[PDB]
From a paper:
Single-stranded RNA bacteriophages (ssRNA phages) are positive-sense RNA viruses that have shown specificity for gram-negative bacteria by exploiting host retractile pili, including T4P6. Acinetobacters have type IV pili (T4P), which are involved in twitching motility, surface adhesion, biofilm formation, and natural transformation in gram-negative bacteria. Our study delves into the interaction between Acinetobacter phage AP205 and type IV pili. Using cryo-electron microscopy, we solve structures of the AP205 virion with an asymmetric dimer of maturation proteins, the native Acinetobacter type IV pili bearing a distinct post-translational pilin cleavage, and the pili-bound AP205 showing its maturation proteins adapted to pilin modifications, allowing each phage to bind to one or two pili.
Using single-particle cryo-EM and helical reconstruction, we obtain a high-resolution structure of the purified straight T4P at 2.5 Å resolution and model the mature pilin into the cryo-EM density. The mature T4P pilin subunits have a distinct “lollipop” shape, presenting a globular C-terminal β-sheet domain and two N-terminal α-helices. They assemble into a 60Å-wide filament, with a helical rise of 10.0 Å and a twist angle of 91.9°. The β-sheet domain is exposed on the outside, while the α-helices are buried within the center of the filament. Within our helical reconstruction of A. gp16 T4P, additional density corresponding to potential glycans was observed. These glycans are added post-translationally to the last amino acid Ser147 of the mature pilin. Surprisingly, a 13-Å gap in the density of the polypeptide chain is observed between Gly78 and Ser79. This indicates that, in addition to the post-translational cleavage at the N-terminus to remove the signal peptide involving the first seven amino acids in the prepilin, there is another cleavage in the middle of the peptide chain, a phenomenon not reported for other pilins. While the precise mechanism behind such pilin cleavage remains undiscovered, the fact that it takes place on the external surface of T4P suggests a direct influence on its interactions with the environment, such as its engagements with the immune system or phages.
Residue numbers in the entry:
A (entry chain CA), B (entry chain BA), C (entry chain AA): 9 to 78
D (entry chain BB), E (entry chain CB), F (entry chain AB), G (entry chain FB), H (entry chain EB), I (entry chain DB): 79 to 147
Amino acid sequence: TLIELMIVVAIIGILAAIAIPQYQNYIAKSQVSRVMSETGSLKTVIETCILDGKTAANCELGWTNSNLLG
Amino acid sequence: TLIELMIVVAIIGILAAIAIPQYQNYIAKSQVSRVMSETGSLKTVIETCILDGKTAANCELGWTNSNLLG
Amino acid sequence: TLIELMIVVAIIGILAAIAIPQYQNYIAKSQVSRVMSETGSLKTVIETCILDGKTAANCELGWTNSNLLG
Amino acid sequence: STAAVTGQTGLTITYPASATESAAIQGTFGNSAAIKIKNQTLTWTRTPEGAWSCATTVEAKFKPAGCAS
Amino acid sequence: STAAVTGQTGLTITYPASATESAAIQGTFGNSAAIKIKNQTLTWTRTPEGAWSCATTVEAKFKPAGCAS
Amino acid sequence: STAAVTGQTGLTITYPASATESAAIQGTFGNSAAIKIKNQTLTWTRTPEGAWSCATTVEAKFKPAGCAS
Amino acid sequence: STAAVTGQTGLTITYPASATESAAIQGTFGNSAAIKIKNQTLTWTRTPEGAWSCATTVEAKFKPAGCAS
Amino acid sequence: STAAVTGQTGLTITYPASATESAAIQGTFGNSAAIKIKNQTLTWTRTPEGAWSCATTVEAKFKPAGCAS
Amino acid sequence: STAAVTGQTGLTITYPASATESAAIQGTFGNSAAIKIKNQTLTWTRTPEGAWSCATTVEAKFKPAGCAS
């Protein structure tokens, strides 16, 4: 019957119009937290270099490339 | 067909009704543990001040502000 | 749209079946190392007592109760 | 800063002035802490003999193994 | 690599040369980061007294609780 | 808290009484330890010559490099 | 779009202010909804312990299996 | 709800008491579940060494790839 | 199990021996994996200096952002 197909179309339209939350906030917060942790990991070596009295060129960082540019 | 859409709606209902594992415990325990570590870090300076004989005003803390008030 | 829900269910099943490493090893090793350090801290006082000539009852231990029985 | 006065209102120190009283470092939760524990305290107390121990007023299920009364 | 020159363009180190300067570890987003935060920065600053703090130029809703100042 | 009578039952001190005996500090796990290592022990033994060494009855994979004996 | 002020009038959030209050997210139907359920509500309530549950004032025929409470 | 007694009759926990026994988290189906799988069980078993695995008594047709043992 | 021999045929470990070669953790897909990526590999390589990196032979559109090398 036609009314059943129309109800199916209405259900499809209802499902297609679901409210999508702003997922950008989630990913942005996760990336910022990861960059925070990665940059804070260097505080140990920086503090040891400063307290040892070494220069900028003589301070060896164990830094590895991060897929996030930070 | 209508039955397929009703099955989809039922699956959506099952997925939306998942049980939340009550995550408050994990966050609270982690915060309490980090406060434990932060406050225990001051035991060294407090003990050195006490064993040195300094007064309360003459004991220099290395304390920095903590995002948790503790 | 049923295939989308089936793909979602498959992804949920894939995520739920992640391989959990034997985390018992890390915790056991950390606890054993901590007990090692606490027990080795008493070597100083034991050695001083022995080299001083004191008896077992006259050797004062600065031992504090450890949440690990060791 | 100093034991007499610190830079944070949530951290207090009871510093002994004689040989028969105990020392204490107390921290009160807040700011970025969870609402459930927004006003509880965690304290490290030191007896005059020189023994340190921890205590807290949070619920048992939140206590770590090191501060179980 | 070293503090003077690093192997990544997005990471910079401001190393103090005297007792009155402050150290800095700055990281600029990009590459695989989100487009919205593509050119923002997150920095760790160390005062000459030896106190570390975090700051960032990202929007408020993206900041974690640690770097909210 | 003395060598003859320790504070807790999990710690035992074997104190030499002559010039030919060896000293020992033994700790049995328990309380807040893992269930797998609940009743194992870790000992520091000192020969009469004055040499200290460590032994443990826990599984090999849990042994730190110091007490791999 | 914050908890205090949502984007639309059909969504309300009761945000706890103390450790003894329960959070709530309430949504009232309308607009494109059916006439029969035009002014009903569906709410997600969170106890102070941290347990979430769902409830609704719609008739039992239209209630999904997850909110039949 | 604790390991000794849970708040639901359909979920049970077998908690080890020694280092030589395994742990189990078992859950039966019911009420909102389908009639076909009404009284089947799904269990997570943890060996004494610390390895987790999943099993179920439901037909292999309904078995997800994770618990197809 | 061990680095020399593992309990799974799809996981291999290349262990350094001469202090100048790289370490490798390689995993070949299969079993419950998709047919398209049934025989590809994903590897973690550690340089002698101590730097870890990831690589994979799967197609570009299936690669995560981390292993896009």
